[PDB]
Symmetry: D2
């Protein structure tokens, strides 16, 4: 696609999130860059309102699948890049098993030379001392496959996966993600055959940073198609 050409090098990224979980309001700003050639992202996020009222790992998926590496033999299946520069809307509901849910809406588009992800998040029905509001999730992250299908009637894609968040007591908290992406612009996009994205995420801290924050490094690679 034409949008693909915008990703051949290193692209600066900005992330902005306005959040409300059980009435606790908060904001996060992020910045970094993406190198889709290697399917690699580097981002740092800061809670600018003080302490983040939910665990950092619960927000990883919310904080730019246009940086996925699509191998050459799968390049006609890259919806994300095909929607650029005008972008796409990404909406999710994330159901935390035996707990509350997040609902998110984001616009992912170029603003000048920068890929910008602007999100609104609303979380409801969380348990005051469940794993989320009780901060019981470990500061780590597992590898996942993100399943993608075309949604022709909406000129976009439907996406589903289930994050496994390790809890401090040895158990796992699941977070079931129902996701849709739809183009912002009117130009044609690539609607894919079924496939998946293999995703790895490394969370760390900036030793020079005193605010509540998260450093993220991600690798994302499309797979599953040989026709």
């Amino acid at each position: 696609s034409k949008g693909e050409e915008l990703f051949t090098g290193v692209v600066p990224i900005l992330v902005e999130l306005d959040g409300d979980v059980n009435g606790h309001k908060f904001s996060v700003s992020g910045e970094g860059e993406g190198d889709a050639t290697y399917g690699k992202l580097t981002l740092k996020f800061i809670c600018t309102t003080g302490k983040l009222p939910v665990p950092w790992p619960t927000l990883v998926t919310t904080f730019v699948q246009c940086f996925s590496r699509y191998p050459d033999h799968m390049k006609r299946h890259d919806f994300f890049k095909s929607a650029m520069p005008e972008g796409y809307v990404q909406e999710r509901t994330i159901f935390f098993k035996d707990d509350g849910n997040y609902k998110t809406r984001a616009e992912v588009k170029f603003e000048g030379d920068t890929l910008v992800n602007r999100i609104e998040l609303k979380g409801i029905d969380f348990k005051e001392d469940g794993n989320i509001l009780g901060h019981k999730l470990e500061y780590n992250y597992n590898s996942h496959n993100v399943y993608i299908m075309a949604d022709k009637q909406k000129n976009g894609i439907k996406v589903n996966f289930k994050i496994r968040h390790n809890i401090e007591d040895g158990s796992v908290q699941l977070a079931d993600h129902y996701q849709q992406n739809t183009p912002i612009g009117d130009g044609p996009v690539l609607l894919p055959d079924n496939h998946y994205l293999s995703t790895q995420s490394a969370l760390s801290k900036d030793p020079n940073e005193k605010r509540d924050h998260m450093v993220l490094l991600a690798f994302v690679t499309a797979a599953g198609i040989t026709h």
Copy 2:
């Protein structure tokens, strides 16, 4: 699961289809056996009403995913066998791109020692000299991945994939499958995490058979989960 034990050896299979495509009525009977230990199926189908009014390859998917091989580390994700012996209802719409569609409903269950697949099929809006009613498909079959997701809210699974049917002029006819599977019985069943089945199908003819028929050998293996 309990139902898993029913598939440790060779199980006889019967298949019965009653069909109507654009008003053309037909019946097909099938028989053979499955060996889920190897993900292997061998079946022969006969059109008992005369000539089959659609190409045999378009019915391959319609004609027992309980015979899939689930490797030991994925056995908790085998919905199909866990629903046995009482079985499951399998419903599909199959959309032939630029052509008509099949809607099917099937009960797959043990009747005595035999696994029985009883199907009703209705096809509508087919073009009279399209690839299907014009018999323009080659007698062959590609390898496909069948994507499975849980639908817990509806007590079953949702399955999606797109068959590529090779056409006699070198093009491909796409057949987009939307499938739902629901237990028939009351007992506990396994709802899987997202995964796929890798499917290969060999079509052939019985040299001693003068009626319109298809011999089918399949291998199906589950993949995609390491957690």
Copy 3:
């Protein structure tokens, strides 16, 4: 490769083996066809000297990897078709754990329009009532990955894998395969990056065949490269 073009359709196959295992001399003739577009082989083998003195499954690997399906994105890695029509020599040692070994030399090449596999096999040091000469192997077959690497100095490849043969008492007999393939002709061949072949095999009988025999259907697909 130029040799690739010889496999775009269905290609008849002939197999001939002369064997001697612990002094037991036997001969097997086989015939059928291959369709590399689908990675598919169908073959029937007959022991023309009487009863086979070793179990049929032990000879499956010996009885045409040129019929593998190489996906379009991996076609530069298909050594086997590149060596045609002049062909290649395939040599193996097969070490049956806690038992004897087979040593084989085969020529695989076109003779007219037919792909012929002509093999000499020598087996030594088998135990008289071990799993092999004692006929304790089940008539079935598991799926395997066949690992391929280039051998630049021999202008060919080196191949390794270990077959798991199921035994009648529930155990497994291992057969470790050390394999080398070299071109017969002096024309250019394709030397691959490391990859593997995913292989599935279905063994059956011809109900109207009174001779000692085996019917074989195989699917083979190359994988492991996206660069």
Copy 4:
């Protein structure tokens, strides 16, 4: 038993003495690994000054014991089985149309630290080539690392081919021939054939003045379901 040593975060030390076409250098590295996620974080410093070869050419030389082996493949993890006593890792790396590295390393626990001590000899490099001429980009591709048992040495043989992107758009290949053997007398796990899928991110420390490399790696075993 060696498995048990990797359930949590394990500090790492790396020490390399090198000589490439007579150019002597040393590198010290440190960080940690978390095999539960197959994840490594390491920082390397050239302590002798400028590194005389590109940082990417040394990535594979600078602890496969931190690979994630999924539960169904745990019987195939040679690397951890050799711990704490360790293994020797030897390689020849052939750079196509250029010279070669030969390495010998001991990888073992020294107290609670996993330590990788390497000797590297490089020869027959072209002074104007991709390596000594510093024409490799500061990046890294994903690779599969193919492992087989070597029963008669009671270890493994490993082969793969690194693709290093060149500053003009071409690729410099580095064919790795690798062998690992136990240092101790204890039993080890000899695996069935399989591979490790490897991803590597190279970066810089914005406050580090010395010639250095920051590396993050993810490594996961695959290919077995029997």
